[PDB]
Amino acid sequence: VVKMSPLPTVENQFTPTTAWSTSVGSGIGNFYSNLHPALADNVVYAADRAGLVKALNADDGKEIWSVSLAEKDGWFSKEPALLSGGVTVSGGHVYIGSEKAQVYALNTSDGTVAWQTKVAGEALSRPVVSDGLVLIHTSNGQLQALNEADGAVKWTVNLDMPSLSLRGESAPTTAFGAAVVGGDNGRVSAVLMEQGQMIWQQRISQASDVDTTPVVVNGVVFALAYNGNLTALDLRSGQIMWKRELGSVNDFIVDGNRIYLVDQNDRVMALTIDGGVTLWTQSDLLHRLLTSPVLYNGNLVVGDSEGYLHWINVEDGRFVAQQKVDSSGFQTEPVAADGKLLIQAKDGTVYSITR
């Protein structure tokens, strides 16, 4: 393994602290996972890979309800559910997918199971809810839409057979009655929410921990290819607008006039949204194994595998603060919503962070 960069010395412009922390089972341990917390109506919903799901008060982290989704039917009396994609919350349901090709819907009220559906393959990516449907990108190369009410598969879309197990997240994006899916062996496709009818498909690369989830901003689709280039596509036609050669990029977000990304070496970079030109690079975290970035209080925030959060000025890439949070480390994405910043550690502990 590559030796990571030392902890940068930062003069804190402010002093971020931990509001609260709450255990959630045994987390994801050492397995790769995209499992992360959700927040809705002042309640944080979080899970661990073994199958525990908890609802927590967002102000103090105290348990409101909890439920174990472990199977009671296997050889052994208890069998881990292998929760993986999610957590996603929408319309009174908590949606989670598993590596056993199940998708669960839990009632936000009390954690009881509203429905559970066997889908076409492993569900490693977050469920995406739109137009009354729960979209599940399965790891055997299909996109399935489940009714939010009863979990039934409304439609299925065939993609390319991956014939190669990839762990990196690949959620669909939704916009204007359509879903856009990447991570399809160098192809991006747009389909109609109504029946999964395909509208356009575009090759962004020929036939590694890359998040190939497309991001739609103002009629432009931003997409990373398995290989490492960033492409901008016209949302409605799928025509390529521009491409930037970068060499493996792990995660990116888009805001204002910038694209913020973290590459495979944990270099943090800001790019122009119209052309993908580099604006700044922050290289002090090289090989510390960063989470995806999130925007919070005007700053860019990332966690690392040693359990630190790094606060970055979006203008020039320099640090404005640093804090030690957790000893087991970070891996899954921080979540910024409703004025809060949440992050779940590898051992399962969920933190709320105060600027």
Considering only CA atoms, which of 217, 224, 222 is closest in space to residue 232? Answer: 222
Distance CA 2, CA 165 (A): 24
Considering only CA atoms, which of 246, 291, 253 is closest in space to residue 273? Answer: 253
Q: Which tokens hold the place of 287?
A: 């090989």
Q: How many helices (H) and strands (E) does the chain have?
A: 0, 32
Distance CA 306, CA 113 (A): 35
Burial (0-12, 13-18, 19+ Cβ within 10 Å), 6: exposed
CA separation, residue 189 to residues 8, 146, 162, 210, 273 (Å): 41, 19, 15, 18, 21
Strand partners for 192: 178
Q: Which tokens hold the place of 281?
A: 């690079």
Q: Which approach determined this entry?
A: X-ray
Q: Per residue, what are the HEC states of 18-74?
A: EEEEECCCCCCCCCCCCCCCEEECCEEEEECCCCEEEEEECCCCCEEEEEECCECCC
The Cβ of residue 176 has, within 10 Å, a number of other Cβ atoms equal to 10
Element (H, E) at 113: strand 113-118
Q: Is the dihedral of CA 128, 134, 136, 142 positive or negative?
A: negative
Q: What are phi and psi of 260, to 5 degrees?
A: -110, 130
Q: Cβ neighbours of residue 165 under 8 Å, at least 6 residues apart?
A: 139
Distance CA 121, CA 157 (A): 13
Q: Which domain holds residue 252?
A: 1-355
Q: In which residue are the tokens 């030690």 written?
A: 324
To 10 degrees, the CA torsion angle through 301, 223, 185, 140?
A: 60
Distance CA 145, CA 155 (A): 5
Q: In which residue are the tokens 């090709």 written?
A: 101
285-321 as b/e: b if 16+ CB within 10 A: bbbbbbbbbbbbeebbbbbbbbbbbbbbbbeebebbb
Considering only CA atoms, which of 247, 241, 207 is closest in space to residue 224? Answer: 247
The Cβ of residue 228 has, within 10 Å, a number of other Cβ atoms equal to 18
CB 173 within 8 A of CB 187: no
Ranges of H-type helices in the chain = none
Using only C-alpha atoms, the chain has a radius of gyration, in whole angstroms, of 19
Stated in angstroms to one decimal place, the resolution of this structure is 1.8
**Number of separate domains in the chain:** 1
Q: Cβ neighbours of residue 100 under 8 Å, at least 6 residues apart?
A: 81, 82, 122
